[PDB]
Amino acid sequence: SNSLPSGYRFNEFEIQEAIGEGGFGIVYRAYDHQLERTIAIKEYMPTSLAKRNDDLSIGLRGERFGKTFQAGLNSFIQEARLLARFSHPGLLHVLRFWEENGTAYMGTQFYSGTTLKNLQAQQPEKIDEAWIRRLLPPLFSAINTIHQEGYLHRDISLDNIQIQESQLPVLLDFGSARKEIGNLSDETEIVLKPGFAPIEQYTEQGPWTDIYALGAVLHTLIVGSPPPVSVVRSIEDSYQPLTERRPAGYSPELLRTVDRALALKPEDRPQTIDEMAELLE
Ligand SMILES: Nc1ncnc2c1ncn2[C@@H]1O[C@H](COP(=O)(O)OP(=O)(O)CP(=O)(O)O)[C@@H](O)[C@H]1O
């Protein structure tokens, strides 16, 4: 692990545990001793470009990586600024941002529960049609809130949706720094998510782009895996409609909503979150 130790201090903040460690950042449970509350701290840390020094700052693995490391850092800052535009229960709430240790940190609300990806892996039996229909209103609301301010998410999958102990969802991360590093480094495999990204993301985009990814999430919950990669579909569409599979315990109404969200061409999908929600009625 490259993570700061339990007990490390950022003035009033104390690290408690590294709870997430991926290729591009570390997430810590932390504590604010001034306000006496638990928070999360997200630390930019691209492992392919940087390493942990003895004094616990971050340093480049090679001088040639500096330009890309800085561009990822700038994208991390821009994503924090985007999330700071909102005060919505389904969007990661940003408390503070600062630079230190050669990198940057976001202090955020700490959420109960775990990711949808982990829930689907650990407790698939909890995920049925009734549970999905309770998930959708607050998830629709969070995504639509982004859209109404003129932005798109563009990185939806199961990995970045938190399911709280209340079952309410939170969008945690837009992948901005990861995707910028991938574009600049020609590491194409870290930019789009296969099976979740629709055809128009491979090179126009709008609310329908996030709608397709949401359909791909729902498809994964219902049958266990995402639909075929969208470029492959654009050559020979092997997607078989869920209305035709008939997985046990799922209504044609929910199944056709997923199928419509997964229409290959943007114009054939629901055009807004509101349009997709109407399909379930
Ligand atoms: N604000 C927040 N509050 C609580 N948990 C958060 C959070 N932001 C991110 N997380 C958690 O951080 C983790 C980030 O995922 P990541 O893939 O980087 O780490 P990981 O694989 O080491 C642990 P996991 O098995 O959950 O994925 C997820 O478990 C997510 O639930």
Please give the distance, rounded to the nearest whole angstrom, from the Cα atom of residue 13 to the centre of ligand 1.
19
Please give the distance, rounded to the nearest whole angstrom, from the Cα atom of residue 20 to the centre of ligand 1.
4
> Residue 16 corresponds to which tokens in the numbers above?
């408690």
Please give the distance, rounded to the nearest whole angstrom, from the Cα atom of residue 115 to the centre of ligand 1.
7
Q: How far apart are CA 69 and CA 143, in angstroms?
A: 29
Q: How far apart are CA 111 and CA 132, in angstroms?
A: 20
Domain extent listing, the chain: 1-281
φ/ψ (deg, to 5) at 247: -60, 145
**How large is the C-alpha radius of gyration of the chain?**
20
CB atoms within 10 A of CB 25: 22
- Cβ 39 vs Cβ 30: under 8 Å: yes
Nearest to 75 by CA among 185, 225, 1: 185
Q: One-letter amino acid identity for 169?
A: P
Q: One-letter amino acid identity for 98?
A: W
> Residue 221 corresponds to which tokens in the numbers above?
């919950």
Task: Show the ligand 1 pocket: residues with CB < 6 angstroms.
Answer: 19-22, 27, 40, 92, 108-111, 114-115, 118, 162, 172
- Cβ 107 vs Cβ 96: under 8 Å: yes
> Residue 9 corresponds to which tokens in the numbers above?
């201090």
Sheet holding 9-10, edge to edge: 9-10, 13-21, 25-32, 37-44, 103-109, 94-100
Please give the distance, rounded to the nearest whole angstrom, from the Cα atom of residue 19 to the centre of ligand 1.
6
Q: How far apart are CA 110 and CA 128, in angstroms?
A: 27
CA 213 to chain centre: 11
φ/ψ (deg, to 5) at 86: -120, 155
Q: How far apart are CA 17 and CA 14, in angstroms?
A: 10
> Residue 144 corresponds to which tokens in the numbers above?
């639509």
Beta strands in the chain (DSSP E): 9-10, 13-21, 25-32, 37-44, 50-52, 58-60, 94-100, 103-109, 114-115, 161-163, 169-171
CB atoms within 10 A of CB 261: 24
Which 8-state DSSP code applies to residue 64?
G
- Cβ 157 vs Cβ 172: under 8 Å: no
CB atoms within 10 A of CB 218: 23
Residue 138 DSSP SS3: helix
Q: How far apart are CA 171 and CA 158, in angstroms?
A: 10
Q: Which atom of ligand 1 approaches the CA of 20 most closely?
A: 19
CA–CA distances in Å: residue 26 to residues 94, 135, 137, 170, 244: 16, 27, 30, 18, 42
Q: How far apart are CA 214 and CA 18, in angstroms?
A: 29
Q: How far apart are CA 190 and CA 180, in angstroms?
A: 9
Residue numbers after which the chain is interrupted (C to N above 2.5 A) read 203
> What are the residues whose beta carbons fall under 8 Å from the beta carbon of 47, sequence distance 6 or more?
2, 23, 24
Please give the distance, rounded to the nearest whole angstrom, from the Cα atom of residue 270 to the centre of ligand 1.
31
Q: What is the resolution of this structure in A?
A: 1.5
Nearest to 8 by CA among 52, 46, 49, 47: 52
CA 186 to chain centre: 21
Mutate to test the pocket of ligand 1, among 83, 115, 171 (most ligand atoms within 8 A of CB): 115
- Cβ 254 vs Cβ 280: under 8 Å: yes
Express the helix, strand and coil content of the chain in percent, nearest 5 each: 40, 20, 40
